Amino acid sequence: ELVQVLRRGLQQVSGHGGLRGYLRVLFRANDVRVGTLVGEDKYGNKYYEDNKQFFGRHRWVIYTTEMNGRDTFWDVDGSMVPPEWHRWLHCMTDDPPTTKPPTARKYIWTNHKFNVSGTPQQYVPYSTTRKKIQEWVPPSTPYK
């Protein structure tokens, strides 16, 4: 009945930490759904699921408000998800990194980086090869 729908909405606003948390999530993600916390990201992101939603809406992430150096309260993008949670979020696998951690290597980045385009840390292409032809160096002494 309609009364039960209103009660569900009241439970939704109650289950986000009160009115302030409800408003924060509404203005940060334009969604106020409540789901089971799959896990927490080292950079601050939180990953939730709800299998009762249809495919595509059954997994989501609340992004952190503080990334490496920038304020991400309003400026968020899909490039801030770490690779393991990237695999879990895009439904490439059913096992979260919490229960199926990736293999550990000493060359894998320990600190994820987002898209740094339009930023002094952007990639600038250059040639990785050395000089090909060496020119003759004239002697430093006079010839006469």
Partner 1 sequence: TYKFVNMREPSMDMKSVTDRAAQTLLWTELVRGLGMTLSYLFREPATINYPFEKGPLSPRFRGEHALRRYPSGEERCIACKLCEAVCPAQAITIEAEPRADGSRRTTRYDIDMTKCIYCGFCQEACPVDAIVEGPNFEFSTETHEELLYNKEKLLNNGDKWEAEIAANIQADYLYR
Partner 2 sequence: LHHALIPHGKGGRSSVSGIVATVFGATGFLGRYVVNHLGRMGSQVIVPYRCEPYDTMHLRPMGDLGQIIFMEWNGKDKDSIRKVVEHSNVVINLVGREWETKNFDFEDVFVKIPHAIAQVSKEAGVEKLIHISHLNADIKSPSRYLRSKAVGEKEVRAAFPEATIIKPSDIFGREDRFLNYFASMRWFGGVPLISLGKETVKQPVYIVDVSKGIINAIKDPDAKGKTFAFVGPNRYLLFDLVQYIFAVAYRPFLPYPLPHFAYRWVGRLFEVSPFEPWTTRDKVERVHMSDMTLPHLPGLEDLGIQATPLELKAIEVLRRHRTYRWLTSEMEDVKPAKTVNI
Partner 3 sequence: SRGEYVVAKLDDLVNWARRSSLWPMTFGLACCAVEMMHMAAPRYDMDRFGVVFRASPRQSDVMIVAGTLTNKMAPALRKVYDQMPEPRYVVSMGSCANGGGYYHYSYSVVRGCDRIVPVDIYVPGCPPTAEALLYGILQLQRKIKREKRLRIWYRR
Contacting positions for partner 1 (CB under 8 A): 29-31, 54-57, 59-63, 76-79, 83-84, 86-87, 89-93, 102-103, 105-109, 112-113, 115, 117-118, 122-130
Query: Binding partner of residue 135 among partner 2, ligand PLX, partner 1, none, CB under 5 to 8 Å per kind?
Result: partner 2
Please give the torsion angle defined by the CA atoms of residues 83, 85, 90 and 96, in that order, rounded to the nearest 10 degrees. 130
The residue within the footprint of partner 2, chosen from 36, 55, 135, 138 (CB under 8 A), is 135
77 binds partner 3 (CB under 8 A): yes
- Provide the mask over 113-132, with x wherever binding to partner 2 is found by CB under 8 A and - wherever it is not: ------------x-------
30 binds ligand PLX (CB under 6 A): yes
Of 31, 49, 52, the closest CA to residue 39 belongs to 49
Euclidean distance between the first and the last CA atom of the chain, given in angstroms as a whole number? 109
Measured from the CB atom, the residue of 108 and 133 that comes closer to partner 2 is 133
Single-letter amino acid, residue 49? E
Under the rule (CB under 8 A), what is the footprint of partner 2?
125, 133, 135
